[PDB]
């Protein structure tokens, strides 16, 4: 295997997914240069669980999932095992036993617009918390009250998604961040993804 892992495609994608509709890219049968990601000044978040970031090029995995999406600066801390909040509860949930790295960086100059970028959505209402790696892309009117909605928006009958309104003059806590979550899978099978 002399296929150099297409991390460029994940990290430098012109378009990123909404967090409710988070994108998963399967990385298989490939060589991973993690060192060019970690040994840089690019990433304000680079947190690994069950593994060390200096050692990543020494490691072999069955497969690697790369999940990616945009959220607010203030929400990046919710992309971790054991976190609560709208994002962890209703949008993207890591399992307690997560093995992988959460990588984020400020995308203000790409994902903010004067007058606001409303492209990026998050789910604001849901009857219950997501299971780890559950993807809910439904847009059913959320019944807040005791009267049923029957698809009519009204009082206590809400569209369940809301837009971030990314403006380049927002406080950095409210500025967009691109997030990439790398899951390292190990099971009784040939490890397909390995450092150089």
């Amino acid at each position: 295997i002399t296929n150099l892992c297409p991390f460029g495609e994940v990290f430098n994608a012109t378009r990123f997914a909404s967090v409710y509709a988070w994108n998963r890219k399967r990385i298989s049968n490939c060589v991973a240069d993690y060192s060019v990601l970690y040994n840089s000044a690019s990433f304000s978040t680079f947190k690994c669980y069950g593994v060390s970031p200096t050692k990543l090029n020494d490691l072999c995995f069955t497969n690697v999932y790369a999940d990616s999406f945009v959220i607010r600066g203030d929400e990046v801390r919710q992309i971790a095992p054991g976190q609560t909040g709208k994002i962890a509860d209703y949008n993207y949930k890591l399992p307690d036993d997560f093995t992988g790295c959460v990588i984020a960086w400020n995308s203000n100059n790409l994902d903010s617009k004067v007058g606001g970028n409303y492209n990026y959505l998050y789910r604001l209402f849901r009857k219950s918390n997501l299971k780890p790696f559950e993807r809910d892309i439904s847009t059913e009117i959320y019944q807040a009250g005791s009267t049923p909605c029957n698809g009519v928006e009204g009082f206590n009958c809400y569209f369940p998604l809301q837009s971030y309104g990314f403006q380049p003059t927002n406080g950095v806590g409210y500025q967009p961040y691109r997030v990439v979550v790398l899951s390292f899978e190990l099971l009784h099978a040939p490890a397909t993804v390995c450092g150089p």
Binding site: N39, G73, D74
Partner: peptide, 17 residues
């Protein structure tokens, strides 16, 4: 303290845990 890439520096209080 924040946990970024090896060479990352910044003054964004919100990025600090």
């Amino acid at each position: 303290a924040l946990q970024g890439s090896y060479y990352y520096t910044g003054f964004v209080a919100n990025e600090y845990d």
